[PDB]
């Protein structure tokens, strides 16, 4: 819920600025006296400025599992956004 960026010029640079940073892709979002970096901020901050929920880019960490003996599942795929933990449970039974 915090975002500290500096003169970010793209969505990629924004996302790399921190786990709480999000990017507004709304056309003309930038005013005359503002840098493109204004598009980069926390979700609540962008909503305040009128960016619609579906125009806020916010890649998020995800865990997908698949399917034994002692441990399950057997396979797990994690998509990791820097600074944002991906969580999944492993079950042990004998």
């Amino acid at each position: 819920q915090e975002c500290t960026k500096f003169k970010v010029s793209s969505c990629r640079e924004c996302i790399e600025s921190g786990p709480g940073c999000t990017w507004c892709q709304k056309l003309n979002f930038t005013g005359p006296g503002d840098p493109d970096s204004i598009r980069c901020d926390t979700r609540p901050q962008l909503l305040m400025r009128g960016c619609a929920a579906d125009d806020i880019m916010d890649p998020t960490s995800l865990a997908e599992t698949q399917e034994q003996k002692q441990l399950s599942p057997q396979k797990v795929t994690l998509y990791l956004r820097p600074g944002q933990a991906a969580a999944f449970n492993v079950t042990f039974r004998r």
Binding site: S10, C11, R12, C14, I15, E16, W23, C24, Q25, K26, L27, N28, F29, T30, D36, R39, D55, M57, P59, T60, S61, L62, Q68, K69, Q70, L71, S72, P73, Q74, K75, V76, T77, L78, Y79, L80, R81, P82, G83, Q84, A85, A86, A87, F88, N89, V90, T91, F92, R93, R94
Partner: protein, 120 residues
């Protein structure tokens, strides 16, 4: 009765902690590895694994195992650093049709300037 969950050596870019929800409602949070005592027959125990990357990493895999057992949980890690923004494929008017629309910003073609590539 003593069950430890651990993983093979990882690069400095990956951090992993374990939450151990043992029997008798005994729970350990954010430890270097899973650790529970007891474990009655057919009684399952759960460990919550949390993986955090410090940067956009290169894809790789690693394994999680319970010490003393041959079972393996294969973990594949991939970066989540790309934005899936809207492009201009369905509107030649975007950026006045003289620049590329990239996540809300127009990257004007040479000779064109302006936030919407309208000037010059």
């Amino acid at each position: 009765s003593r069950v430890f969950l651990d993983h093979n050596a990882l690069p400095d870019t990956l951090k992993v902690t374990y939450d151990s929800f043992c029997s008798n409602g005994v729970t350990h949070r954010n430890q270097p590895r899973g650790d529970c005592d007891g474990v009655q027959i057919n009684v399952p125990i759960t460990f919550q694994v949390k993986v955090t990357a410090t940067e956009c990493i290169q894809e790789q895999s690693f394994v999680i195992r319970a010490l003393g057992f041959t079972d393996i949980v294969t973990v594949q890690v991939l970066p989540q650093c790309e934005c899936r923004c809207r492009d201009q494929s369905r509107d030649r008017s975007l950026c006045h049709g003289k620049g590329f629309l990239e996540c809300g910003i127009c990257r004007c073609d040479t000779g064109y300037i302006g936030k919407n590539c309208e000037h010059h």
